Symmetry: D2
Subunit: 259 residues, 4 copies
């Protein structure tokens, strides 16, 4: 099943879509600068692009740690991004009450992995009618993803993306099961599956650029709707060379018939 | 470090406290009936007991599963439980705005495992000044619990309980690391540690729950936590082992 | 099912048996000294005891690392141990051809965890007719132990002990699933199950840790405990025996 | 570091080499027929190919399941494969005593995963001077492979291949950590790394084997290790077309600096 996001077709047999941007919104000017770099790189390579950022860091290490611009200012920044670049955007939501005002502006709304079983958040997200990105928790198996999908379907929204971010592997470590992508496709109605390579790696001794590339290449080899990543996270200047490689592999894989 | 909860002393060197009740509050009459059974069994054995229920469950198996009676009626029910039986009570909260009004009534407030890193909720819970039960997520290592504890401390509350519920073990299965109890004690200032045996098992039976409860309580724990006369036979065995363990001094040096 | 090892009764409802000793045999004098200490401690506490050692270290970090005394000399030392102390002994075997000469001397022969799927070794061990200790590999689940047991039964030997040593948990770490003991008892005809606490901890082995883990496992009702280790052994065994006596005095439910 | 195996170059920046064949040698005629099919398909696609089988399977489902034809007859069959097709062959050894007679005939000898820490076998294999395939145990982390390599190096043999077969993931399940390939290359001197997709999948089908094989080969590997009967033997060509496409793309691009 494909999902249309403005003029973008997202699907497991379509050219991969990049979901990329930054961890947290800090200011309008920095955001526009970072976004302009993603837009020019992706446009030249012919890769469909959706700009990603959080307006709030909800689970920071300290109560005193900087958390970002917040809802009202964050939505102002997203409105400016869409106006300036004409691209879709994606952000996460952590409270039911935020879903409607966020969905008015943001094309895709994201369910945080830690909140995937917050049933009132699922319902509030579903009711927006927006495209939803479901972050697969590290503690949930790929065959249990269908239970989250079921909830969104019972609540009347079928425009769902499934986002791999790795699986718990002993203490404080993650592994990405390359077979989990296929399990999700087979058991969740072939909804678009995307791969968050960045968060999949957060527990490895260097977020290495070579590591991220090997892991991204491996996952895309399984035939995926998209790649989800952050830069500052990959350094922003290496983005073009990274994406050249991803696109070469995706174009190859997508050109071969399924069987 | 011990925590006093009315007349109960909760601590890793104290007789174990049982936390148990029902999943979701439905009515005063049904609640009182179930609570009266736990109270009668625990009184008969002399085991300190704290009644547990949810008034508004946000993590339900289905989206239209009953959440519970809700805040206003749930707190009325909890008041009546406390008045009738003279025991403390425990409930979970998932919205920051609920923490204050809940804490007026409920002796212990519980942080759901899935929300354990949600800073706004941790702060709102801390600020109640109530005793807080911190449910350990299945994805978190025992040495990371200190970071949650640190956030509660920054927010001004040190009356914290750590609740083990198992760890992710490949797909679906949970395993309980019996060494994790000691790691939490060592790194978190010897706060009371309790063992939620039920959740630890839902991914795997009475004989199982008994082996696993006994193994955990052998490590010297403040309490045992159950989720949704067999209860009596079970508690007799747990109390035997607890009484033996707690009567012996901790290992020399 | 119980197993008789000379005058010792080994079984999951019998007083626990300690299997202990040293890693690798280095000399007669140092072996007799270590064995005498275990004997003195176990005798004064009233705990049945089987002396353990390897005659060959088959996994050395270096090709030039010292291997131990080897078969011929090792069996001489075991014969001296049995003669001086009148106790049973246990050793591992890594090659089929070693099984018969080792079994002439050693009461219990042990199948190393890495070799548990070496079918020719299983057969050669079974054909000795000796009591066998089957080390559960860290990569095998408890419900797969019945397949190893089946092989020994087909080869004509039912005097089998199942020995827990933990399960692989991420990279370079182990966890012990306390539910795995009950699985093995239920699926393998209630053969004696013992717990190797020492090898279960290789990857973490503090004294307080070893004690918590040993207590937790023995709380599930086991035939024995298997270890390599100011009076640490006696302090440890006093606690284990207290718990084992309590658990074994309660009827199975 | 590359390894030459007769006229084949094996290395992490060379075209992938296929190691394939069957589980246990059972008969000469059937072995030759199977091998002929691998040969014809791989020659057609220009893929370097090494025929694999066990002559003495030591880890059997039952004690009386057939172990295979045994050493003497198994080596005769391997000699016939080499003579008829002019390709290298690979087999496993489980006992120190078997290392010499197997190494005299077989171009690669293989260290079974479960025996990977058995020092006497490692020494005996090393001393043959033969190319060695080291199967990574499911319980060993990728940064511990260097310790096995070290033992071979101490014993005088550096012609070593590292073979991924997955990692224990909870009970009875395996996961392949796609980052482990790079850890092995970085810590073990960039020895050839190959991927046993067949044994990596025991615990879970054709679509799965393909996804997993493609993912692994995307990380830039010296080879792919598989069995057929296990993959069905007639789908081999379609499978290898896909593997070869991806491998040719990857290998044609310079390593990222
Ligand atoms: Cl994110
Ligand atoms: Cl093989
Ligand atoms: Cl059999
Ligand atoms: Na050779």
């Amino acid at each position: 099943m494909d999902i249309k996001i403005n003029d973008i077709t997202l699907g497991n047999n379509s050219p991969f879509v990049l979901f990329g941007g930054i961890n947290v919104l800090e200011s309008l000017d920095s955001t526009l600068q970072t976004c302009a770099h993603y837009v020019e790189v992706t446009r030249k390579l012919g890769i469909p692009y959706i700009f990603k950022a959080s307006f709030d860091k909800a689970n920071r290490s300290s109560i005193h740690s900087y958390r970002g611009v917040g809802l009202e200012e964050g939505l102002k920044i997203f409105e400016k991004v869409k106006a300036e670049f004409g691209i879709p955007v994606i952000t996460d939501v952590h409270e039911p009450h935020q879903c409607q005002p966020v969905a008015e502006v943001c094309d895709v709304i994201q369910l945080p992995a830690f909140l995937a079983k917050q049933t009132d958040l699922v319902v509030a997200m579903a009711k927006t009618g927006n495209v939803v990105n479901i972050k697969k928790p590290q503690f949930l198996s790929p065959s249990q993803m269908k239970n989250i999908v079921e909830k969104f379907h019972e609540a009347g929204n079928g425009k769902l993306i499934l986002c791999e971010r790795g699986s718990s592997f002993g203490y404080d470590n993650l592994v990405v099961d390359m077979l989990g992508f296929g399990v999700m496709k087979q058991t969740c109605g072939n909804l678009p599956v995307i791969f968050d390579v960045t968060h999949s790696l957060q527990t490895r001794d260097a977020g290495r650029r070579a590591q991220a590339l090997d892991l991204a290449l491996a996952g895309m080899a399984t035939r995926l709707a998209g790649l989800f990543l952050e830069s500052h996270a990959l350094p922003l200047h290496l983005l073009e060379d990274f994406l050249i490689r991803i696109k070469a592999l995706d174009d190859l894989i997508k050109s071969q018939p399924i069987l």
